[PDB]
Amino acid sequence: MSLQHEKVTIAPLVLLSALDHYERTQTKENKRCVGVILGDANSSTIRVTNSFALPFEEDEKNSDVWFLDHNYIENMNEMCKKINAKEKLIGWYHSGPKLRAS
Amino acid sequence: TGRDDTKETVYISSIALLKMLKHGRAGVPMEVMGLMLGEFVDDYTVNVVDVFAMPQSGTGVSVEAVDDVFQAKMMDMLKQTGRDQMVVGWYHSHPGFGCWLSSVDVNTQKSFEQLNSRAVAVVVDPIQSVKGKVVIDAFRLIDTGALINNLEPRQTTSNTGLLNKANIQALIHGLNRHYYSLNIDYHKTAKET
Amino acid sequence: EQEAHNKALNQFKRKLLEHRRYDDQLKQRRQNIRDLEKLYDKTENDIKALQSIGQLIGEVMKELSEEKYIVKASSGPRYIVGVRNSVDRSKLKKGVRVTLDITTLTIMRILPRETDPLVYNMTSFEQGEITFDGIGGLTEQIRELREVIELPLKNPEIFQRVGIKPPKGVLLYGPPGTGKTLLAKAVAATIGAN
Amino acid sequence: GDDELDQEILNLSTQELQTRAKLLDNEIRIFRSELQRLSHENNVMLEKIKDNKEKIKNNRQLPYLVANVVEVMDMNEIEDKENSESTTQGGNVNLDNTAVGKAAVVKTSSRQTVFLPMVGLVDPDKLKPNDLVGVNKDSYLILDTLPSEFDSRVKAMEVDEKPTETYSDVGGLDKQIEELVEAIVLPMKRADKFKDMGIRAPKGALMYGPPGTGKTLLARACAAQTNATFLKLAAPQLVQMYIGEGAKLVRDAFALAKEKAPTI
Amino acid sequence: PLQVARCTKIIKGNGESDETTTDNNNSGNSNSNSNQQSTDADEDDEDAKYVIN
Numbered sequence: 001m002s003l004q005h006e007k008v009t010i011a012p013l014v015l016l017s018a019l020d021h022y023e024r025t026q027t028k029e030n031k032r033c034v035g036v037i038l039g040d041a042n043s044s045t046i047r048v049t050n051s052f053a054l055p056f057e058e059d060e061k062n063s064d065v066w067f068l069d070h071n072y073i074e075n076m077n078e079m080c081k082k083i084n085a086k087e088k089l090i091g092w093y094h095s096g097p098k099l100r101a102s
Numbered sequence: 103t104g105r106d107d108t109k110e111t112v113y114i115s116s117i118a119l120l121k122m123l124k125h126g127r128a129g130v131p132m133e134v135m136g137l138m139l140g141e142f143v144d145d146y147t148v149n150v151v152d153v154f155a156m157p158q159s160g161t162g163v164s165v166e167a168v169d170d171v172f173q174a175k176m177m178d179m180l181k182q183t184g185r186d187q188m189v190v191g192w193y194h195s196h197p198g199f200g201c202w203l204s205s206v207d208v209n210t211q212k213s214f215e216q217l218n219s220r221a222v223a224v225v226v227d228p229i230q231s232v233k234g235k236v237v238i239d240a241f242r243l244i245d246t247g248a249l250i251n252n253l254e255p256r257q258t259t260s261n262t263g264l265l266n267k268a269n270i271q272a273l274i275h276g277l278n279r280h281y282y283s284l285n286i287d288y289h290k291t292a293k294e295t
Numbered sequence: 296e297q298e299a300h301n302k303a304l305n306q307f308k309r310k311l312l313e314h315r316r317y318d319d320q321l322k323q324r325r326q327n328i329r330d331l332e333k334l335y336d337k338t339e340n341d342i343k344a345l346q347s348i349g350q351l352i353g354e355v356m357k358e359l360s361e362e363k364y365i366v367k368a369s370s371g372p373r374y375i376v377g378v379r380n381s382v383d384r385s386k387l388k389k390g391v392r393v394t395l396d397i398t399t400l401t402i403m404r405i406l407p408r409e410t411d412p413l414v415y416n417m418t419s420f421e422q423g424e425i426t427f428d429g430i431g432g433l434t435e436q437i438r439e440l441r442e443v444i445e446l447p448l449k450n451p452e453i454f455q456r457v458g459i460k461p462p463k464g465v466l467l468y469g470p471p472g473t474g475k476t477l478l479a480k481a482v483a484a485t486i487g488a489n
Numbered sequence: 490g491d492d493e494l495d496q497e498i499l500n501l502s503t504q505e506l507q508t509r510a511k512l513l514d515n516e517i518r519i520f521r522s523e524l525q526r527l528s529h530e531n532n533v534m535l536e537k538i539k540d541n542k543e544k545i546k547n548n549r550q551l552p553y554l555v556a557n558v559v560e561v562m563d564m565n566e567i568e569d570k571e572n573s574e575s576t577t578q579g580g581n582v583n584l585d586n587t588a589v590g591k592a593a594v595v596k597t598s599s600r601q602t603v604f605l606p607m608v609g610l611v612d613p614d615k616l617k618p619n620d621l622v623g624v625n626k627d628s629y630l631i632l633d634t635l636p637s638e639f640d641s642r643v644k645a646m647e648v649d650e651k652p653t654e655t656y657s658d659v660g661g662l663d664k665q666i667e668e669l670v671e672a673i674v675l676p677m678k679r680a681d682k683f684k685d686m687g688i689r690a691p692k693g694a695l696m697y698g699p700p701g702t703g704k705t706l707l708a709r710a711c712a713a714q715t716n717a718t719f720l721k722l723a724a725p726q727l728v729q730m731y732i733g734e735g736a737k738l739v740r741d742a743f744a745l746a747k748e749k750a751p752t753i
Numbered sequence: 754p755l756q757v758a759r760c761t762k763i764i765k766g767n768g769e770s771d772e773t774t775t776d777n778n779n780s781g782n783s784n785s786n787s788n789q790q791s792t793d794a795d796e797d798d799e800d801a802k803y804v805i806n
């Protein structure tokens with residue numbers, strides 16, 4: 001872990017995919033797309049190379065009830081590294097449409 | 103026949119244009135590649151929704167670089183998220199040539215025709231584009247038997263078509279042999295824009 | 296005896312001669328599958344080599360920018376070239392030798408500094424051994440030769456005492472057959488530099 | 490040394506020989522199944538090396554470019570998966586910068602230099618700096634090794650049998666024939682006897698006198714008698730108007746004499 | 754147009770192991786390039802190669 005990250009610069013492609021992904025999974029409010037975020041970090045400049053969708057189901061009756069496909073993530077991480085090695089897990093996007101405490 | 107036959111107008115969505123370029127520019131001067139997800143409607147209207155890249159197990163644009171497991175594994179993943187749709191072509195890069203398929207890449211396109219009837223091979227130029235706009239052209243390969251007995255003109259009518267002469271003479275021979283080329287258009291959502 | 300197990304042992308001894316036949320074939324085929332896979336290493340390498348290309352060697356003449364370098368090629372003309380993005384930008388500077396694809400003219404990878412093939416042939420030469428007991432008559436000249444050739448290699452700290460420069464450049468001259476070529480041949484196997 | 494016969498009944502109990510005999514019914518099944526594997530595999534492995542030979546014969550066609558080898562790099566193809574070179578250095582993933590193995594930088598006769606990773610048909614145990622090699626013109630790959638050859642003018646100097654004069658047409662001058670065969674003919678034939686004496690053989694003989702005394706005759710004789718390679722040379726042929734190509738003629742003619750050894 | 758060139762060395766293309774599929778130093782037959790390691794019995798190279806300059 002490091003807290004040394006003073007800026008994040010994000011490619012047009014990362015924005016465009018995550019946004020694009022929201023209607024490709026055909027989710028509407030109060031259902032969430034989340035995806036894996038791939039890119040560079042450990043540096044001040046964060047450089048956000050790419051992103052790919054995960055399935056994500058949110059139950060908000062209990063914010064302790066959640067769906068996350070675990071296995072999917074590990075599999076996908078390894079394939080991306082063979083195209084380009086600079087892709088690491090640097091986070092995950094939440095589709096909004098606001099911040100939560102959750 | 104089964105259809106009158108004419109070459110596809112490719113409505114390449116924003117995310118797919120932008121993605122092929124990212125991957126292929128990074129890949130200079132190697133050949134780069136991957137598969138196209140889309141849907142085929144109308145007599146010529148192919149909408150390409152997304153692309154995904156095929157991990158290099160070869161030099162790129164080989165059948166050593168197309169892995170059966172990989173193909174299987176990616177498809178199996180796309181179902182969970184609903185991005186599973188049928189393969190409408192494959193992309194590749196020449197960054198040493200214009201839009202014009204080389205002999206090895208024809209051999210790759212000959213194998214794709216077995217997979218899909220309407221598969222395209224799309225040449226992406228990452229640095230070598232000669233206009234302000236990105237030069238990309240899509241090709242389809244149909245047999246020599248229809249083309250020689252003079253069925254090539256019929257196939258190319260009732261559409262605006264595209265003519266390019268980027269490698270001049272070399273292109274014309276190749277163009278002829280493969281099939282044809284057709285205007286490439288871009289699908290923009292006003293959210294995306 | 297007069298057993299029927301005397302007869303059984305004759306009957307299974309026909310299997311023990313048949314164990315010997317099996318051994319001749321089994322070991323012969325085992326070793327031959329091991330030979331056809333030695334051959335199989337050279338005849339598959341043609342195919343893999345055939346999926347390789349030649350790459351025009353050049354050298355980074357001088358940096359313009361990070362994407363665009365100037366490489367002067369070893370055929371004449373200066374080019375302005377692109378990069379592979381594996382090639383380290385701090386490893387690309389003037390003097391360094393690079394290789395270039397013949398299709399794209401792109402800086403493919405770094406190489407160590409290269410030298411003319413004539414000069415590799417010059418270092419090959421040196422064979423056998425001669426010592427300074429195979430030289431005679433010249434024990435005075437052996438010492439002034441070593442004064443210049445052996446010493447600043449071993450210790451330039453000696454020349455530093457006096458505060459004077461070390462010598463370099465020896466000219467040997469003589470009437471023919473005085474061993475001037477011989478003197479140098481002998482000292483080349485002794486000193487142990489290149 | 491044989492077992493399972495009537496002789497072992499005398500030596501040893503009949504109980505031991507029942508267990509020895511029931512065993513050889515089981516042991517032969519190992520030989521039979523495993524023989525099927527090898528004979529069937531040995532038809533498939535024999536197909537692998539012929540299937541590639543068929544493609545080898547499409548490449549081998551003529552003509553093809555000529556090169557010499559500037560330097561064999563001799564990087565290590567496998568030595569780690571942290572590199573893929575002879576060099577070892579901290580950090581994994583150096584991408585395709587590490588991808589240099591047994592490698593030839595050849596310099597063509599178009600007077601350009603290419604790097605390539607060689608064809609292992611041509612071994613790098615052949616290649617040395619300055620060897621003639623073929624290289625396929627289309628994509629520079631060492632197709633083969635060509636035997637080293639030298640200028641066509643040098644090749645012309647080699648003997649084609651110069652007319653036998655014997656030593657009945659070198660009439661008189663006995664002492665000269667005697668002095669000459671000692672320095673030239675004995676170190677070839679009797680090369681063993683001087684090694685024993687611990688002296689060295691000559692490097693040459695000079696024949697000098699007034700013109701017309703058959704110094705040229707005695708050499709022509711010597712050609713016919715020793716039956717080795719005799720490199721005829723005329724000293725104004727050697728001098729050449731292109732700068733130091735007269736010198737190229739010296740070194741090649743003598744380089745040639747190393748090969749065709751023993752020589753005159 | 755026929756470019757005028759010149760012979761520098763007559764090289765033998767059969768029986769010299771021009772094909773190096775069994776040659777590794779001097780392990781080659783030098784008697785065959787027609788059934789050396791060939792699928793054919795008949796010719797696969799020419800009788801005479803030559804070195805043009």
Ligand SMILES: Nc1ncnc2c1ncn2[C@@H]1O[C@H](COP(=O)(O)OP(=O)(O)OP(=O)(O)O)[C@@H](O)[C@H]1O
Pocket residue numbers: 429430431432433470471472473474475476477
């Ligand atoms: N100083 C010496 N002590 C011992 N041996 C000698 C000496 N000088 C010459 N010889 C012997 O005679 C041989 C021939 O001499 P060499 O060819 O080395 O002479 P050089 O003076 O270098 O010749 P050149 O004038 O042709 O350049 C030596 O190899 C050696 O056996």
Ligand SMILES: Nc1ncnc2c1ncn2[C@@H]1O[C@H](COP(=O)(O)OP(=O)(O)OP(=O)(O)O)[C@@H](O)[C@H]1O
Pocket residue numbers: 658659660661662699700701702703704705706
């Ligand atoms: N002793 C001899 N016995 C037999 N024939 C001789 C004898 N000497 C010379 N001849 C003959 O005379 C011919 C001419 O002499 P040749 O040209 O061989 O002489 P050389 O002294 O080596 O000359 P130069 O230095 O002028 O080239 C010889 O070809 C040979 O036929």
Ligand SMILES: [Mg+2]
Pocket residue numbers: 476
């Ligand atoms: Mg000398």
